[PDB]
Amino acid sequence: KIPRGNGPYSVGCTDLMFDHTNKGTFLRLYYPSQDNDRLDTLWIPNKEYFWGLSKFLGTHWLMGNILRLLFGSMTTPANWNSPLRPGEKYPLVVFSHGLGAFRTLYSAIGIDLASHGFIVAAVEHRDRSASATYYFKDQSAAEIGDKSWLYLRTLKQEEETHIRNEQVRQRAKECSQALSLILDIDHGKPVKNALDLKFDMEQLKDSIDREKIAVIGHSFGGATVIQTLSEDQRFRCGIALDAWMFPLGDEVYSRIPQPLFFINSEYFQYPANIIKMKKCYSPDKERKMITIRGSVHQNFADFTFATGKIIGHMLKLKGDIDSNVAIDLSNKASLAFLQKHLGLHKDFDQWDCLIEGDDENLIPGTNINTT
């Protein structure tokens, strides 16, 4: 089970694609919902995502069919296409997935943020860092639902520096474009969802607290946080979840004026990666960093909830720490940081102590020795 969210709000989920092309925006939306009696949301909604996942894991596509047998009917606890809870403007998180991931795999985070009164746009990237993604070749294909699939690109070592940087730059543009789409929907622009879904986008009119925007992301998505902040001042702060810093260009490090929070796992991090995070530091800039004791890279994504404890540890999906305990720490510390730097009038300051790593299961800063 993916956990249900700790906040007072019920949670809805839908998908938005606009336009229908490989250059349009594709996102999964999590939002405070009016109702709590809908079907739960299908977690991995297409067989081709399983084919993509099997390629990312270095197996034959036929392992994809076995993963689909084991996991293809798994749901996540969000009310599919539930009406948006009316009467309040909601702050906005744009969420960026990791390498080999896609938009639906960070529902534990997306659901928890939404249960606290956030709208969450989990983008699906078309830079070929997703395990799989889809789009429509033209208007005809979109009408009849003829999906074109785009699979993970594997790189030779000589391509790494250049291609990861091209990708992080496209990822930032995709975050900015997703922001402009949501803001235009908030400002009443008619948008026809390229997906035929029973959630009217007109509900979102006048529903965004338009100055309260953050970008959050895991791993490749953590580097996406930083590139996005340096390029788009509409984002007011960022939270990098176990950032993979390698994609970033040398130019970005001195160019991040917004508050930035690094939330790390204990076992993922390494000196080259920590050195790049420290390069973001400057006396005039707000920076915070914590490490979750006993945690692994996968504690930030939904695979940590997908299996039992023993299989979980073996597959490196779980750490020594309990998965619910770890994600509560990451989500609560995130809520307190967002309250501080977005100026929210909520009770998230009860977790201010966590921003400073003051908890038995937190390390302030990093366990990683550099120099």
User: Which residues have a catalytic role annotated?
Assistant: 219, 242, 297
Beta partners for residue 64, in sequence order? none
SS3 227: helix
Using alpha carbons only, what angle is made at residue 167 by residues 15 and 236, rounded to the nearest 5 degrees?
Answer: 65
Query: In whole angstroms, what is the distance from residue 151 CA to residue 22 CA?
Result: 12
Smallest separation (angstroms) from Cl ion to the CB of 238: 22
104 binds ligand 6HU (CB under 6 A): no
Cβ closer to Cl ion: 80 or 267?
267
Which one among 137, 145, 316, 367 touches ligand 6HU, defined by CB under 6 A? 316
32 binds ligand 6HU (CB under 6 A): no
- HSE, CB side, 13 Å, CA atoms: give it for residue 45: 14
135 binds ligand 6HU (CB under 6 A): no
Cβ closer to Cl ion: 14 or 291?
291
Which one among 12, 77, 100, 217 touches ligand 6HU, defined by CB under 6 A? 100
Cβ closer to ligand 6HU: 168 or 306?
306
Backbone angles phi, psi at 357, to 5 degrees: 70, 25
53 binds ligand 6HU (CB under 6 A): yes
Query: In whole angstroms, what is the distance from residue 206 CA to residue 302 CA?
Result: 31
- Tokens 């906005």, located at residue: 92
The candidate with the shortest Cα–Cα distance to 133, out of 239, 45, 57, 243, is: 45
Burial of 83 (0-12, 13-18, 19+ CB in 10 A): middle
Smallest separation (angstroms) from ligand 6HU to the CB of 101: 3
Smallest separation (angstroms) from Cl ion to the CB of 265: 6
The count of chain residues that interact with Cl ion, using the rule CB under 5 A, is 7
Pick the piece of the chain touching ligand 6HU (CB under 6 A) from 223-231, 280-288, 314-322, 359-367. 314-322
* String marking each residue 257-296 x if it binds Cl ion according to CB under 5 A: ----------xx-xxx-----------------------x
Query: In whole angstroms, what is the distance from residue 91 CA to residue 148 CA?
Result: 33
314 binds Cl ion (CB under 5 A): no
